[PDB]
């Protein structure tokens, strides 16, 4: 009855494999893009969320949390492909 509800960044499953531990922010911005959300409470940590909810068919949410360091250098990746 309702329209499609889309939120976040479109991850193509071929970009998330282009990112290794050691890349700065410009590189991940060229590969994946600029995210819509982050952690404003001090730390630098980006969240690429990919959420889609069509009409009365379910939700799909992929989460990619990238934890950087103080000098713009990737330090940890965390991928949740499906939501419980």
């Amino acid at each position: 009855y309702r329209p499609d509800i889309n939120q976040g960044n479109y991850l193509t499953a071929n970009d998330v494999s282009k990112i290794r531990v050691g890349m700065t922010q410009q590189q991940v911005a060229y590969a994946l893009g600029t995210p819509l959300m982050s952690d404003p409470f001090g730390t630098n940590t980006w969240f690429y969320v990919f959420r889609q909810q069509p009409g009365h068919e379910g939700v799909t949410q992929q989460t990619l949390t990238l934890t950087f360091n103080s000098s713009g250098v990737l330090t940890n990746i965390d991928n949740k492909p499906a939501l419980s």
């Binding site: 509800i5 404003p40 959420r51 989460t63 939501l83």
Partner: protein
């Protein structure tokens, strides 16, 4: 149709001043428009411009007051009594605002004007009221953002919610709507299964209320 004779300027101006004091503005507006057209370079045409700003303000002809203010500030940018004109600008924009879900651009304009006035001239008489108005306008803008976030919470959007609440915590942190909007960000962070941030939002909440 409000026909005006060609009496000398003194008596026209004294009649104007004798109709404002009573509380009738539609009358003196005509006399001042005349004394402006008929003498666009008289000895007290500026005075007439100030009086026309006042009249157009208290008569609900606000766009004409905006025009008069812009003109007066262009032609006499160093007039001793220019604080009055900036105060009238802020007041005109506040009136055009006239209802927190509606367009706030007029409120932003009024905020900018009152900011100019209070930062430039703090020893004036038109400043304390300026701050008392700035507080109100800030709260109004925060309430607008809160209404938007509430809509996007009803819909099911959880990224717009956090983005807008962060924008509020950035621009309007010292208000009550903001204090009333952190739960929405918590619920959003929890619905997308990011609990490590909902815990932070709760840490913030429990430290204030």
């Amino acid at each position: 149709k409000e026909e005006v004779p060609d009496n000398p300027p003194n008596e026209i101006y004294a009649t104007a001043q004798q109709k404002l004091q009573d509380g009738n503005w539609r009358q003196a507006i005509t006399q001042l428009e005349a004394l402006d057209n008929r003498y666009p370079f008289g000895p007290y045409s500026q005075q007439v411009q100030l009086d026309l700003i006042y009249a157009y303000y208290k008569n609900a002809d606000l766009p004409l007051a905006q025009a008069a203010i812009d003109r007066f500030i262009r032609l006499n940018p160093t007039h001793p009594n220019i604080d009055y004109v900036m105060y009238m600008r802020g007041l005109t924009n506040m009136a055009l605002d006239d209802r927190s879900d509606r367009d706030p651009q007029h409120a932003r304009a009024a905020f900018s004007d009152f900011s100019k006035l209070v930062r430039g001239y703090p020893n004036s008489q038109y400043t304390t009221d300026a701050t008392k108005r700035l507080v109100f306008l800030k709260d109004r803008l925060a309430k607008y953002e809160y209404s938007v976030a509430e809509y996007y919470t009803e819909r099911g959007a959880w990224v717009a919610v956090v983005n807008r609440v962060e924008g509020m915590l950035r621009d309007y942190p010292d208000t009550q709507a903001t204090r009333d909007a952190l739960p929405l960000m918590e619920n959003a962070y929890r619905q997308m299964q990011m609990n490590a941030q909902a815990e932070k939002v709760a840490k913030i909440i429990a430290a204030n209320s």
